[PDB]
RNA sequence: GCGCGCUACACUGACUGGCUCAGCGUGUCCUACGCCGGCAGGCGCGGGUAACCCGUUGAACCCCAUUCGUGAUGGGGAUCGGGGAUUGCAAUUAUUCCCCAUGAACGAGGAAUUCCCAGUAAGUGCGGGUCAUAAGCUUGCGUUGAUUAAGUCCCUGCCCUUUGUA
């Protein structure tokens, strides 16, 4: 079916990200975009911003797959 | 990243429905007579940040993009980019947009059909006009 | 000592079934730093038995037309996949791979005896090598196919597939196909 | 005081010049870690990890690579380094030490000392490749 | 100006071939067997092997 | 007497090796400084044409090879001696080109 | 510490940043508009591509000497995709390579060779080897 | 009427040189390479055929095998019989067709009707 | 007359070239300056010096 | 309406930038270097009848960053409008080549059917032949590099031996 994903964050999704993302077993642009109904670019930008704050660890960086994870 | 306060969901520019969701550089390719190359240079010449989404552009910015798209020559866009370089009638350099390109095409087709030039006759019959084999292929 | 990608140990890994104990290579004397060997393991018969199971996986990964000789990229797909595996489940990825191949292998197959057009099959046993072959083939086709036209990448799709396959989840393509093949053998007998 | 040997894979050739010194490791004037196909960096570190740095202590090797392709060059250079060391530990050390190196290198992978002889097979008329033939249409 | 070794060795080939074709069509009747050409910058010699030389002279 | 070089070029290997060896041993016995045979890359001329005149068959191809073997021998000897040593050595199926400086 | 001792990816970015900071590199009028080859579909994304290209050109000229406009056009060549026709190797733009070399000559980093090509100047070799120094220092 | 922002009345008086750049790249190259004898011979025939004609009635037909002649401001108004391989096709050269060839206005093959 | 007999230019093109043997202008081998038809070359290959090895 | 094929249907992917490796073999037409043009190309002056110069043949996939986000979309580039160059005496039924614009079918293909066992299949470029202009063709060369089999006469044919035949 047609997948109408959100280009920009809304308040109902943005507060949900800052609370819940921060603690998932595996961190990546794919699963975040799929679960929260986000666009690929915004979901990829969100993880970079969370790394700048310092809530999430970068496990390995690459072109194809960037893997993130919760700390402790 | 940040929540948009006044996200213009649909843009109404040059009698065209532009989707703000797509990034501005590729967003304006939806306009006929504008490709993925001419769009880029137009935005770069107006010194707008291409990173911005088409939905979050201010009134003055989109108005600048329209006025620089209409009259390219004034804003130092080179001669070799213009869609219409040497116009058969008046012989000037211009970039023709949606309605203009459709009007100019049907006019150019009419001009060729008027004089009974081979290309005109091949156009009027609904055949190929670049001299391909029309036997084996090009069905319907 | 020797560790896969210099960060995964090959001593803490354990084989379950004795049948495949000499047909899954990953052990002390087969411990390699990378999957990429460029050996002559398809030179004659029963030589690929001595191929590292990680190499067999990354070799069977570069399958479809556009990626036929693109090994250097399957090695990094498997590297990322192994990292994703470790992040999700916690324990050694090589154990998860072995568990996946142990579960995924069909034990009783069906062979064609009769004419073409009509279907008439005899249910027969499967050799330990053929069990390993089909297991790897099914895992890769499940990964590949699952991630073909959707956003999740091949790396996390292969990981997801091996997570499901290792703990015998019905969601795994490899488990569904094994189940069906054994059910068809059960239908014939 | 020095020895000079070649490692070969397909049409790739890597010549390693081994002399005495401070455990220097350079290929075409570049360190191993700075070689372009970084994905296979470990393949260059194979001979130095297997034997241990202590054996390389009193040896400077200078490798120069020509011909072949990227991975073929990687297999040429990693073969050349090991062949250079065993040649040096043959000529200016006891044979016992050379055997103590050789057995470990062979026991890991035979490719490190013995060259992979197979080459790109000749193409024949009637097809695109050496075996494959063009499509044969009946009616 | 001088031609390449490749073109030169080819040229000598055609010379041999054409000379043979001419000699065959001329001395067929006198059983022309074969020819041998030795080349020296002083002067190049052509040696005709035929059944009855008395006639070909 | 300065730097005469001798370029021996042939299609046969045996005749070329024989004649060049004779030139070398002929020069060596006279006590002349000689730089030995410099073997250049063998030039292989390839022609690949259809077997058939008409063009009806299974599309078979001939493969015609032509080999050119080139040897250089260099002498530091006088032109008078070089002329006679180059003169004596003649063979049908070798081309000799002598150059000075 | 030398250019060969450091990573060649980070080195270009460092040298590009230095060439930007100098603020005396004569950029053409058509940087905003023109492509970088016959076979590129779009203009380069980065606004400061001229500095990265200039940096790359200097690094190439450091690694081997006697490199003309033709050689530089051969360096920045790629795969021309011809739609339904199969893809062939296409060469870079000559003008961009010429203007880059002219612009670097402007800095007195590169000068013309008596043999015919262009070699890096001792001032250039200094600058390049210095940049390598701090790129190495940043680990 | 106008061609490339130039009305016909000053196309006529305009000389051979500055007419070159007004035309498209192909014709410009052709005029740069210069016309041979038969092209001039045709022009002479056409200007004579026009000169001898009445001022009201159209010039008498000039027949030709030259399909590869470029239309010039001189040739506007002329009656040209262009050879199609079999027969001659009569064309009145209008002002609007000042860029093309004669060959384009005389079709060689009959349009295909299927059965 | 004199200016229409062989008047058409033949500096280039398939008509300008011809086989050195049979004067045919089809399937012509013009590599290494052979300048000979493919049929004629196959006949004269042996005595030219071209040999069939592999 | 059929028969060889080439490009695709995308995220193991496109796009932009950076990094780093060939082999066969051809040049009286092969081309370095300098200048001008966005580009196709335009001028000027050199080397090579060739392990000598092009050339250390800085090739492409691939490798490492950037942007894109399942949307007939930044997949795909067919068809069409303008221009600007090179061959050639001559380019229209457009010879090739470049630039801007236009943005079709195509979401892996029914019955059916081809080719192939290791440096093989396949992906991927390069040279030769045609060649004034010139490769979606064939003929060669490297480059990255597999899955499955070490068997059978079931289908399609083949060889030998027995018989049977109008
Ligand atoms: Zn002939």
Resolution (angstroms) stands at: 3.2
* CB burial readout C59-77, b (16+ within 10 A) else e: bbbbeeeeeeeebeebbbb
Per DSSP bridges, beta strands C121-125 and C108-112 are antiparallel
Nearest CB to B115; choose among H4, H6, H94: H94
Q: Closest residue of F to I54, CA-based?
A: F63
Q: Does A34 touch chain B (CB under 8 A)?
A: no
Q: How many CB atoms lie within 10 A of CB C89?
A: 18
Query: G108 vs A55, E8, G2, H34, CA distance in Å?
Result: 49, 51, 21, 49
| Set of chain I residues whose Cβ sits within 8 Å of the Cβ of E11 | 33
Query: Are I20 and E13 an interchain contact pair (Cβ–Cβ within 8 Å)?
Result: no
Looking at chain A, how many residues does it have? 72
Write the burial class of residue D103 (CB in 10 Å: 0-12 exposed, 13-18 middle, 19+ buried). Answer: exposed
CA–CA separation, G59 vs G104, rounded Å? 12
Long-range contacts of range E15-23, CB-CB < 8 Å, 24 or more positions apart? E16/I47, E16/I48, E16/I49, E17/I44, E17/I47, E17/I48, E18/I20, E19/E46, E20/I47, E23/E48
Render I4-32 in DSSP notation, one character per residue.
TSS-S--SSSTTT---TTT---SSEE-GG
| Set of chain C residues whose Cβ sits within 8 Å of the Cβ of D37 | 72
Phi, psi for residue D89 in degrees, rounded to 5: -75, -5
Nucleotide lying nearest to C152, CA to C1' measure: J11
Nucleotide lying nearest to C45, CA to C1' measure: J150
Per DSSP bridges, beta strands D60-66 and D25-27 are parallel
Of C159, C95, C79, whose CA–CA distance to D42 is shortest? Answer: C79
Domain extent, residue H99, equals 2-105
**Could you state, in order of their start, the residue ranges of all structural domains in chain C?**
1-189
Nearest CB to B37; choose among G30, G32, G42: G42
Closest protein residue to J118 (Cα–C1') = C43
Q: Does G4 touch chain D (CB under 8 A)?
A: yes
Closest protein residue to J75 (Cα–C1') = C149
Q: How many CB atoms lie within 10 A of CB D60?
A: 16
Per DSSP bridges, beta strands D3-9 and D25-27 are unpaired
CA–CA separation, D61 vs D18, rounded Å? 4
**In this structure, what token pair is assigned to residue F94?**
């070798």
The number of distinct structural domains making up chain I is: 1
Chosen from H23, H92, H100, H113 to mutate, greatest number of chain B CBs within 10 A: H100
Sorted by sequence, the CB contacts under 8 Å of residue E40 that are 6+ apart come out as F90
Nearest CB to H100; choose among B89, B117, B121: B117
CA–CA separation, H95 vs I41, rounded Å? 59
**In this structure, what token pair is assigned to residue D105?**
């290198």
Q: In which order are the strands placed within the sheet that holds H79-83? A: H62-64, H79-83, H88-92
Q: Which CATH number goes with the domain that contains E38? A: 3.30.300.20
Q: Is it the case that chain A and chain D have 3 or more CB pairs lying under 8 Å apart?
A: no
* CB burial readout B21-45, b (16+ within 10 A) else e: bbbbbebbbbbebbeeebbbbbbbb
Of D8, D27, D12, whose CA–CA distance to D69 is shortest? Answer: D12
108-137 of D, contacting C, C-beta below 8 A: 109, 111, 116, 118
55-84 of B, contacting A, C-beta below 8 A: 55-56
Q: How far is the CA of F46 from the C1' of J141 (A)?
A: 13
CA–CA separation, G98 vs G28, rounded Å? 11
Q: Is residue A2 part of a domain?
A: no
Q: Which CATH number goes with the domain that contains A21? A: 1.10.10.10
Closest protein residue to J93 (Cα–C1') = B131
Nucleotide lying nearest to H35, CA to C1' measure: J89
CA–CA separation, A6 vs B69, rounded Å? 29
Domain extent, residue A48, equals 11-70
Render chain C in DSSP notation, one character per residue.
---BTTTB-SSS-----STTTTT---SGGG--SSS-----TTSSTT-GGGS-HHHHHHHTTS-SGGGTT-HHHHHHHHHHHHHHHHHHH-S-HHHHHHHHHHHHS-SEEEEE-S-SSS--EEEEE--HHHHHHHHHHHHHHHHHHHTSSSSS-HHHHHHHHHHHHHTT-TT-HHHHHHHHHHHHHHHH-
Phi, psi for residue D38 in degrees, rounded to 5: -65, -30
CA–CA separation, A46 vs G108, rounded Å? 45
DSSP type of residue G29: T
Neighbours of chain E (3+ CB pairs under 8 A): F, I
CA–CA separation, D94 vs H53, rounded Å? 114
Q: What share of chain E is helix, strand, coil (3-state, %, to 5)?
A: 45, 25, 30
Query: Are B115 and H24 an interchain contact pair (Cβ–Cβ within 8 Å)?
Result: no
Q: Closest residue of E to F43, CA-based?
A: E6
Nearest CB to D43; choose among C5, C34, C40: C34
Query: Are A40 and C151 an interchain contact pair (Cβ–Cβ within 8 Å)?
Result: yes
CA–CA separation, H8 vs H27, rounded Å? 18
Q: What share of chain A is helix, strand, coil (3-state, %, to 5)?
A: 45, 15, 40
Q: Which CATH number goes with the domain that contains H56? A: 3.30.860.10
Strands (E), chain B: 10-13, 16-19
Chosen from B88, B92, B123 to mutate, greatest number of chain H CBs within 10 A: B88
The number of distinct structural domains making up chain H is: 1
Contact between residue H23 and residue H11 where contact means Cβ atoms under 8 Å apart:
no
**Could you state, in order of their start, the residue ranges of all structural domains in chain F?**
1-101
Query: Are D126 and F48 an interchain contact pair (Cβ–Cβ within 8 Å)?
Result: no
Distance of CA B129 to the CA centre of its chain: 23
| Domain B10-75 listed as CATH 1.10.8.50 | yes
- Owner of token pair 């590599």: I31
Q: Is it the case that chain F and chain G have 3 or more CB pairs lying under 8 Å apart?
A: no
DSSP type of residue A57: E
């Amino acid at each position: 079916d047609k997948l109408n994903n959100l280009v920009l964050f809304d308040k109902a999704t943005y507060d949900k990200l800052c609370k819940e993302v921060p603690n998932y077993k595996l961190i990546t642009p794919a699963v975040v975009s799929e679960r929260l109904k986000i666009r690929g670019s915004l979901a990829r930008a969100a993880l970079q911003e969370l790394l700048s704050k310092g809530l999430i660890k970068l496990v390995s960086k690459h072109r194809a797959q960037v893997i993130y994870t919760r700390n402790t | 990243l940040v929540i948009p306060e006044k996200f213009q969901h649909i843009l109404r520019v040059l009698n065209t429905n532009i989707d703000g969701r797509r990034k501005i550089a590729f967003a304006i390719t939806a306009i006929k007579g504008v490709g993925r190359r001419y769009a880029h240079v137009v935005l770069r010449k107006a010194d707008i940040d291409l990173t911005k989404r088409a939905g979050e552009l201010t009134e003055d910015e989109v108005e600048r993009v329209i006025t620089i798209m209409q009259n390219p020559r004034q804003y130092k866009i080179p001669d070799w980019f213009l869609n219409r370089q040497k116009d058969v009638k008046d012989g000037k350099y211009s970039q023709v947009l949606a309605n203009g390109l459709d009007n100019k095409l049907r006019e150019d087709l009419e001009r060729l059909k008027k004089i009974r030039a081979h290309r005109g006759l091949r156009h009027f019959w609904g055949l190929r006009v670049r001299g391909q084999h029309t036997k084996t292929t090009g069905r319907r | 000592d020797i560790k896969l990608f210099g960060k995964w140990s090959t001593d803490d890994v354990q084989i379950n079934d004795i049948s495949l104990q000499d047909y899954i290579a990953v052990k002390e004397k087969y411990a390699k730093y990378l999957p990429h060997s460029a050996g002559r393991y398809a030179a004659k018969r029963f030589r690929k038995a001595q191929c590292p199971i990680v190499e067999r996986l990354t070799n069977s990964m570069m399958m479809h037309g556009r990626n036929n000789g693109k090994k250097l990229m399957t090695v990094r797909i498997v590297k990322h996949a192994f990292e994703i595996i470790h992040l999700l489940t916690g324990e050694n990825p090589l154990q998860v791979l072995v568990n996946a191949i142990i579960n995924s292998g069909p034990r009783e197959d069906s062979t064609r005896i009769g004419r073409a057009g009509t279907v008439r099959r005899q249910a027969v046993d499967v050799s330990p090598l053929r069990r390993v072959n089909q297991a790897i083939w099914l895992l890769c086709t499940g990964a590949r196919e699952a991630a073909f036209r959707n956003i999740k990448t091949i790396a996390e799709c292969l990981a997801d597939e091996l997570i499901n396959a290792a703990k015998g989840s019905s969601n795994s393509y490899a488990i569904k196909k094994k189940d069906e093949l054994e059910r068809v053998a059960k239908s014939n007998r | 005081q020095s020895v000079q040997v070649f490692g070969r894979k397909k049409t790739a050739t890597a010549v390693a010049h081994c002399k005495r010194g401070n455990g220097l490791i350079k290929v075409n004037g570049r360190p191993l870690e700075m070689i372009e196909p970084r994905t296979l960096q470990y393949k260059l570190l194979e001979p130095v990890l297997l034997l241990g740095k202590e054996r390389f202590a009193g040896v400077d090797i200078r490798v120069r690579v020509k011909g072949g392709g990227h991975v073929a060059q990687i297999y040429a250079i990693r073969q050349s380094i090991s062949k250079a060391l065993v040649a040096y530990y043959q000529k200016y050390v006891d044979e016992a030490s050379k055997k103590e190196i050789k057995d470990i290198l062979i026991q890991y992978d035979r490719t490190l000392l013995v060259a992979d002889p197979r080459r790109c097979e000749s193409k024949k008329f009637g097809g695109p490749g050496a075996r494959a033939r063009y499509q044969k249409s009946y009616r | 100006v001088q031609i390449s070794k490749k073109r030169k060795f080819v040229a000598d080939g055609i010379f041999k071939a054409e000379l043979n074709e001419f000699l065959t069509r001329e001395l067929a009747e006198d059983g022309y067997s074969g020819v041998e050409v030795r080349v020296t910058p002083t002067r190049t010699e052509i040696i005709i092997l035929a059944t009855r030389t008395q006639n070909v002279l | 007497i300065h730097r005469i070089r001798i370029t021996l070029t042939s299609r046969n290997v045996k005749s070329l090796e024989k004649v060049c060896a004779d030139l070398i041993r002929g020069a060596k016995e006279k006590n002349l400084k000689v730089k030995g045979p410099v073997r250049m890359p063998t030039k292989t001329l390839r022609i690949t044409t259809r077997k058939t005149p008409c063009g009806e068959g299974s599309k078979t191809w001939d493969r015609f090879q032509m080999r050119i073997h080139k040897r250089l021998i260099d002498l530091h000897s006088p032109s008078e001696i070089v002329k006679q040593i180059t003169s004596i050595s003649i063979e049908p199926g070798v081309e000799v080109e002598v150059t000075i400086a | 510490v030398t250019v060969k001792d450091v990573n060649q990816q980070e080195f270009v970015r460092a040298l590009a940043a230095f060439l930007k900071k100098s603020g005396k590199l004569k950029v053409p009028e058509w940087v905003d508009t023109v492509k970088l080859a016959k076979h590129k579909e779009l203009a380069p994304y980065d606004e400061n591509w001229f500095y990265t290209r200039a940096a790359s050109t200097a690094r190439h000229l450091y690694l081997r000497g006697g490199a003309g406009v033709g050689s530089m056009t051969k360096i920045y060549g790629g795969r021309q995709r011809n739609g339904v026709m199969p893809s062939h190797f296409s060469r870079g733009s000559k003008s961009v390579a010429r203007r880059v070399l002219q612009a670097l000559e402007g800095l007195k980093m590169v000068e013309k060779d008596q043999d015919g090509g262009r070699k890096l100047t001792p001032q250039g070799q200094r600058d390049l080897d210095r940049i390598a120094g701090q790129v190495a220092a940043a680990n | 009427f106008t061609y490339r922002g130039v009305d016909l009345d000053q196309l006529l008086d305009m000389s051979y040189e500055q007419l070159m750049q007004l035309y498209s790249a192909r014709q410009r190259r052709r005029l740069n390479r210069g016309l041979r004898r038969k092209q001039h011979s045709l022009l002479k025939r056409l200007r004579k055929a026009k000169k001898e004609a009445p001022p009201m009635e159209k010039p008498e037909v000039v027949k030709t095998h030259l399909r590869d002649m470029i239309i010039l401001p001189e040739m506007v108004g002329s009656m040209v019989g262009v050879y199609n391989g079999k027969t001659f096709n009569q064309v009145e050269i209008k002002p609007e067709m000042i860029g093309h060839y004669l060959g384009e206005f005389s079709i060689t093959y009959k349009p295909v009707k299927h059965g | 007359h004199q200016q229409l007999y062989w008047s058409h230019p033949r500096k280039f093109g398939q008509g300008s070239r011809s086989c050195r043997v049979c004067s045919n202008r089809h399937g012509l081998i013009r590599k290494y300056g052979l300048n000979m038809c493919r049929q004629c070359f196959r006949q004269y290959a042996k005595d030219i010096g071209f040999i069939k090895l592999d």
